[PDB]
Amino acid sequence: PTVFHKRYLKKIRDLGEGHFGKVSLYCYDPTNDGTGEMVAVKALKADAGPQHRSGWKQEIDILRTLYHEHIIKYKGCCEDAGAASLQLVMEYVPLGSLRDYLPRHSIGLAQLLLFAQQICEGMAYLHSQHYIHRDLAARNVLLDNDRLVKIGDFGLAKAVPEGHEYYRVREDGDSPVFWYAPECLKEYKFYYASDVWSFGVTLYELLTHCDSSQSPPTKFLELIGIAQGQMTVLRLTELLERGERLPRPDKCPAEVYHLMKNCWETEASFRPTFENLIPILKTVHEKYQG
Ligand SMILES: N#C[C@@H]1C[C@H]1C(=O)N[C@@]12C[C@@H]1CN(c1nc(Nc3cnn(CCO)c3)ncc1F)C2
Fold it and tell me: Associated disorder, per UniProt?
């Protein structure tokens, strides 16, 4: 319900961008004095079509209904008269994404597992509200402080229809295929368990400290090759069905690699849920923290 008056919004810097949107850092100063608040403002590009505009209004509604310590805080909206929609105003998460932060800050295994646990808490909460994320990756996990992480973007999140166990996708060029389970790539169905697969890929990112040369697109494209025409996804699907997986990251314990592999079960029903992961991660964290 909170309305931001565009007259007090001063742009500081870009925070991220996608195909049909951009997130920017703004100082919202209704004075000019030191009572200024820093906010993350997400805007839909003016040239976006009806499918993206309807999806935008759904995204804004999704963030309004979500309130959890490991989910970015919705702050309000303001009229985006330039794009003729609304701008989603959220809290500014100061340390940015783990994708940006990890290659520059060598973080201990213990803090990595704490983040892993926190992502699961935020995800079990999202699944309890009957939503699927569809874009769980380290670029979407924001660092507030060294002991606090938040899921910071919901651009692809969808409500799971009432008497159904999955959502039917309709794959696009923006689909994060390298974080996707076989059932998403093949049958065009996204289950709650499909997010658990993406969590396994996010856990692999964290354990590689988000090193570009070890990234899921880099590692999978080395396995598929580049002279494959329109067949990257088909080749990805068949390597996954042969049981090929991203490798064990350097210094990753065998137990945590096994947990990653368990999130990556080909059969979606064999994967743990986010509720199952929480006491497991709690326990593996206490272990390493000690
Ligand atoms: N459309 C579209 C766009 C692609 C979608 C996008 O940018 N989504 C996001 C997850 C990114 C970052 N972001 C946010 N980032 C922050 N903090 C922050 C500080 N430094 N940095 C840059 C190093 O990461 C980011 N606080 C809130 C956010 F909301 C939201």
Answer: Immunodeficiency 35: A primary immunodeficiency characterized by recurrent skin abscesses, pneumonia, and highly elevated serum IgE.
